[PDB]
Amino acid sequence: QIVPDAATCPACLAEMNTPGERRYRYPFINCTHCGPRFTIIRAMPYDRPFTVMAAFPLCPACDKEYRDPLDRRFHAQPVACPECGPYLEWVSHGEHAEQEAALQAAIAQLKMGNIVAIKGIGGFHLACDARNSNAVATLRARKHRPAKPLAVMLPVADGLPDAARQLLTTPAAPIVLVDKKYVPELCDDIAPGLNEVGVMLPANPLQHLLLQELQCPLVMTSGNLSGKPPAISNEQALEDLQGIADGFLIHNRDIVQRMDDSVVRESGEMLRRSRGYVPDALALPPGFKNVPPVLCLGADLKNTFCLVRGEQVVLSQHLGDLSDDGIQTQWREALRLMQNIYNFTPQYVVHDAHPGYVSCQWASEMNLPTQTVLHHHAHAAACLAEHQWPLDGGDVIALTLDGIGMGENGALWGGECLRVNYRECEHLGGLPAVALPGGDLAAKQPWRNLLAQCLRFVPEWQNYPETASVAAANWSVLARAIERGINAPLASSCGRLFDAVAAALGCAPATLSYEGEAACALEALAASCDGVTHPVTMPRVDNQLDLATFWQQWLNWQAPVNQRAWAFHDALAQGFAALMREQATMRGITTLVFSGGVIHNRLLRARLAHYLADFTLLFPQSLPAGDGGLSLGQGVIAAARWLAGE
Ligand SMILES: [Mg+2]
Ligand SMILES: [Zn+2]
Ligand SMILES: [Zn+2]
Ligand SMILES: [Zn+2]
């Protein structure tokens, strides 16, 4: 049984910090309890010759420890020391150093406020002093990343809440999102416009050496070029990051598996499940047994695949956007190793009903029976599965809130009330479908969604101060395209409604730099309001929320921006609660399910829970509410259909 890549243990950290130890300051120290696992395995069985370490014959002292049954390094497969192992290399515009001198060059660069690329366990990071405004502005400039929050590595967890420290210090060593007020040392460009910062602890020997020396917070963000997957080879890091890093601290131990840092909230809520969790299998819910080998492809964004068999499922690491340049290489290596580990050969493939997906094209190429699952069905089913809802558990009413997923009959969904079981999804209602003006541009430019909302719902929309920029434009050409259905498909998208409101409030740039940016801004703004008496509502007309009434009341309720943002979250939750309550009570359903990336919104969760105290409420916690949990939902649905003899 292989275990996830594990944070350097206290015993290895002590050995590395003890002068006179053969492994004193050795940046590759590991033992049977810690070190890289999944990221250094070429093939099963887990044995040095089938790892990245086959290239490094052990010296006699290492070999004795590896063979000694009582030694902490007994069969530590990637074991090494300075004599026989990998070593550091420094590269910087015609400078070169090795070993300790390489480390020191990287340290000197970081202190002067430069950016260094650092080789990690599962890829490379870009690092700089997180207190240094200039360094962080430079990193943002070079990476064309003006807003997206940067992960920061702290030397210690001191000063953080108990819950954060506990998560930070596990073998998994995730990034943990923490209120930025706990970390005043960070410059303001770490998470601009947001209330939280992703903090992490050193969890490999190199990181410990760096933070021990530096004693300050360090930006520790993914070493990628935008639109590409992270580099895993030195040669790819050097190419990809040349415009960005001032120098490169690399080494000659290969990484074979892309494995990003995991990301959780302090509350324990899973956002991205990679390093430290993969490749642990999970038990399927009660009633799922003897399941055939099923490969589930997930969806195109925030991708994970899932292998289902027997009574367990195993999810891949996060693979990101499947449209990125050469992402198939990493996706396929992950699939090869995962199938090798679990001796798995699929008999069935499951993928999303969206016919334009890359993953769906990959599924067509496998020579296996294929079946599709609706995106929002899979969201709801992943949440059910996580909560161990039995195979014969009964129907729930589900609320699935996201950006875009293909619904029934070619409709674009994103804000739906559904009657769900593992085998069935019936659409009951939700948000009205509203045009996406300019198609893919709608997700990048919030004003487009405000325009689309106003055209549909707001008489004399041009007269409100909140629509001024849109009104000033020649918006009428777009209005014409919307009318004629020219690259303006209808979507009942909760994400785009967020964007429209954010556009009206001016709390995001006119053009976004990352997906979800306007919605994150709006949530961060609403979060500073502790609740307010307000008249804004979203009534229900049939089984849809009445946005005409919402816009009329919201646009005409002047108040501080945070309270306007709060009132929107509150009205949206109340409106969806009323829909779900009617649907569930009249079917004798007592349990409600929530999923989709928008359900990551804390305030919405809280308002929903507030309004729905008369129901058992199921929210995602150990898998992402977003597309990262989707493959699991596809897998339980396929399994349930198979178990029913369909
Ligand atoms: Mg503090
Ligand atoms: Zn160890
Ligand atoms: Zn050795
Ligand atoms: Zn989704």
Side-chain angles (χ1 to χ4, degrees), residues 141-153:
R142 296 179 180 177
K143 230 197 152 175
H144 304 95
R145 190 207 182 95
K148 201 185 180 161
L150 293 152
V152 171
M153 185 168 279

PDB file of all heavy atoms in Angstrom, residues 141-153:
ATOM      1  N   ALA A 141       3.650  41.438 -11.902  1.00  0.00           N
ATOM      2  CA  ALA A 141       3.907  42.035 -13.235  1.00  0.00           C
ATOM      3  C   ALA A 141       4.452  41.022 -14.225  1.00  0.00           C
ATOM      4  O   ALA A 141       3.954  40.908 -15.356  1.00  0.00           O
ATOM      5  CB  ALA A 141       4.880  43.219 -13.127  1.00  0.00           C
ATOM      6  N   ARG A 142       5.472  40.274 -13.802  1.00  0.00           N
ATOM      7  CA  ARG A 142       6.136  39.324 -14.702  1.00  0.00           C
ATOM      8  C   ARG A 142       5.251  38.135 -15.022  1.00  0.00           C
ATOM      9  O   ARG A 142       5.334  37.582 -16.105  1.00  0.00           O
ATOM     10  CB  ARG A 142       7.467  38.864 -14.131  1.00  0.00           C
ATOM     11  CG  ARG A 142       8.471  39.985 -13.997  1.00  0.00           C
ATOM     12  CD  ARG A 142       9.713  39.437 -13.424  1.00  0.00           C
ATOM     13  NE  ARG A 142      10.760  40.430 -13.247  1.00  0.00           N
ATOM     14  CZ  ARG A 142      11.928  40.143 -12.690  1.00  0.00           C
ATOM     15  NH1 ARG A 142      12.148  38.905 -12.239  1.00  0.00           N
ATOM     16  NH2 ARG A 142      12.863  41.085 -12.564  1.00  0.00           N
ATOM     17  N   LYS A 143       4.400  37.756 -14.075  1.00  0.00           N
ATOM     18  CA  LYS A 143       3.555  36.599 -14.225  1.00  0.00           C
ATOM     19  C   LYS A 143       2.206  36.975 -14.827  1.00  0.00           C
ATOM     20  O   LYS A 143       1.387  36.095 -15.106  1.00  0.00           O
ATOM     21  CB  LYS A 143       3.388  35.893 -12.859  1.00  0.00           C
ATOM     22  CG  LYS A 143       3.663  34.401 -12.923  1.00  0.00           C
ATOM     23  CD  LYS A 143       3.117  33.661 -11.724  1.00  0.00           C
ATOM     24  CE  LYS A 143       2.799  32.222 -12.115  1.00  0.00           C
ATOM     25  NZ  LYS A 143       2.367  31.473 -10.877  1.00  0.00           N
ATOM     26  N   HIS A 144       1.966  38.271 -15.034  1.00  0.00           N
ATOM     27  CA  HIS A 144       0.665  38.776 -15.507  1.00  0.00           C
ATOM     28  C   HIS A 144      -0.473  38.265 -14.627  1.00  0.00           C
ATOM     29  O   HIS A 144      -1.462  37.720 -15.122  1.00  0.00           O
ATOM     30  CB  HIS A 144       0.407  38.403 -16.974  1.00  0.00           C
ATOM     31  CG  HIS A 144       1.478  38.876 -17.894  1.00  0.00           C
ATOM     32  ND1 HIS A 144       2.530  38.074 -18.276  1.00  0.00           N
ATOM     33  CD2 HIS A 144       1.698  40.086 -18.459  1.00  0.00           C
ATOM     34  CE1 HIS A 144       3.338  38.762 -19.063  1.00  0.00           C
ATOM     35  NE2 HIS A 144       2.856  39.983 -19.189  1.00  0.00           N
ATOM     36  N   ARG A 145      -0.291  38.443 -13.315  1.00  0.00           N
ATOM     37  CA  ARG A 145      -1.193  37.949 -12.271  1.00  0.00           C
ATOM     38  C   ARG A 145      -1.479  39.136 -11.339  1.00  0.00           C
ATOM     39  O   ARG A 145      -0.952  39.190 -10.254  1.00  0.00           O
ATOM     40  CB  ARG A 145      -0.516  36.796 -11.512  1.00  0.00           C
ATOM     41  CG  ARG A 145      -1.405  36.021 -10.558  1.00  0.00           C
ATOM     42  CD  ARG A 145      -0.557  35.438  -9.475  1.00  0.00           C
ATOM     43  NE  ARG A 145      -1.309  34.631  -8.510  1.00  0.00           N
ATOM     44  CZ  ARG A 145      -1.447  33.317  -8.580  1.00  0.00           C
ATOM     45  NH1 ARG A 145      -0.924  32.642  -9.597  1.00  0.00           N
ATOM     46  NH2 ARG A 145      -2.128  32.686  -7.645  1.00  0.00           N
ATOM     47  N   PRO A 146      -2.308  40.104 -11.791  1.00  0.00           N
ATOM     48  CA  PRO A 146      -2.492  41.324 -11.020  1.00  0.00           C
ATOM     49  C   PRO A 146      -3.302  41.197  -9.731  1.00  0.00           C
ATOM     50  O   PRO A 146      -3.222  42.094  -8.882  1.00  0.00           O
ATOM     51  CB  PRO A 146      -3.202  42.268 -12.013  1.00  0.00           C
ATOM     52  CG  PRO A 146      -3.891  41.361 -12.972  1.00  0.00           C
ATOM     53  CD  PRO A 146      -3.071  40.121 -13.061  1.00  0.00           C
ATOM     54  N   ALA A 147      -4.084  40.125  -9.596  1.00  0.00           N
ATOM     55  CA  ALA A 147      -5.036  40.004  -8.476  1.00  0.00           C
ATOM     56  C   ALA A 147      -4.996  38.678  -7.759  1.00  0.00           C
ATOM     57  O   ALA A 147      -5.095  38.637  -6.525  1.00  0.00           O
ATOM     58  CB  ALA A 147      -6.472  40.273  -8.938  1.00  0.00           C
ATOM     59  N   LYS A 148      -4.925  37.589  -8.532  1.00  0.00           N
ATOM     60  CA  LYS A 148      -5.100  36.265  -7.967  1.00  0.00           C
ATOM     61  C   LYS A 148      -4.220  36.055  -6.723  1.00  0.00           C
ATOM     62  O   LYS A 148      -2.998  36.308  -6.772  1.00  0.00           O
ATOM     63  CB  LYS A 148      -4.851  35.193  -9.013  1.00  0.00           C
ATOM     64  CG  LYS A 148      -5.503  33.902  -8.634  1.00  0.00           C
ATOM     65  CD  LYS A 148      -5.142  32.827  -9.628  1.00  0.00           C
ATOM     66  CE  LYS A 148      -5.796  31.531  -9.247  1.00  0.00           C
ATOM     67  NZ  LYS A 148      -5.826  30.631 -10.433  1.00  0.00           N
ATOM     68  N   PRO A 149      -4.839  35.621  -5.594  1.00  0.00           N
ATOM     69  CA  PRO A 149      -4.078  35.524  -4.317  1.00  0.00           C
ATOM     70  C   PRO A 149      -2.841  34.610  -4.396  1.00  0.00           C
ATOM     71  O   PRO A 149      -2.826  33.611  -5.130  1.00  0.00           O
ATOM     72  CB  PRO A 149      -5.113  35.017  -3.293  1.00  0.00           C
ATOM     73  CG  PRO A 149      -6.477  35.117  -3.992  1.00  0.00           C
ATOM     74  CD  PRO A 149      -6.266  35.221  -5.454  1.00  0.00           C
ATOM     75  N   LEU A 150      -1.790  34.979  -3.669  1.00  0.00           N
ATOM     76  CA  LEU A 150      -0.561  34.194  -3.680  1.00  0.00           C
ATOM     77  C   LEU A 150      -0.475  33.428  -2.370  1.00  0.00           C
ATOM     78  O   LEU A 150      -0.674  34.009  -1.288  1.00  0.00           O
ATOM     79  CB  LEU A 150       0.659  35.112  -3.827  1.00  0.00           C
ATOM     80  CG  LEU A 150       0.762  35.838  -5.176  1.00  0.00           C
ATOM     81  CD1 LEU A 150       1.503  37.192  -5.073  1.00  0.00           C
ATOM     82  CD2 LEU A 150       1.363  34.897  -6.229  1.00  0.00           C
ATOM     83  N   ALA A 151      -0.172  32.137  -2.457  1.00  0.00           N
ATOM     84  CA  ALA A 151       0.121  31.312  -1.266  1.00  0.00           C
ATOM     85  C   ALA A 151       1.405  31.832  -0.600  1.00  0.00           C
ATOM     86  O   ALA A 151       2.321  32.259  -1.288  1.00  0.00           O
ATOM     87  CB  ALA A 151       0.295  29.862  -1.660  1.00  0.00           C
ATOM     88  N   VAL A 152       1.473  31.765   0.721  1.00  0.00           N
ATOM     89  CA  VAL A 152       2.659  32.263   1.455  1.00  0.00           C
ATOM     90  C   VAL A 152       3.125  31.191   2.414  1.00  0.00           C
ATOM     91  O   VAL A 152       2.312  30.564   3.095  1.00  0.00           O
ATOM     92  CB  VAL A 152       2.343  33.596   2.211  1.00  0.00           C
ATOM     93  CG1 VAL A 152       3.480  33.986   3.141  1.00  0.00           C
ATOM     94  CG2 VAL A 152       2.044  34.763   1.181  1.00  0.00           C
ATOM     95  N   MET A 153       4.422  30.952   2.434  1.00  0.00           N
ATOM     96  CA  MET A 153       4.995  30.004   3.353  1.00  0.00           C
ATOM     97  C   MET A 153       5.524  30.744   4.590  1.00  0.00           C
ATOM     98  O   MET A 153       6.297  31.704   4.485  1.00  0.00           O
ATOM     99  CB  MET A 153       6.083  29.157   2.659  1.00  0.00           C
ATOM    100  CG  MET A 153       6.639  28.035   3.557  1.00  0.00           C
ATOM    101  SD  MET A 153       7.631  26.867   2.613  1.00  0.00           S
ATOM    102  CE  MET A 153       6.280  25.893   1.934  1.00  0.00           C
TER     103      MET A 153
END
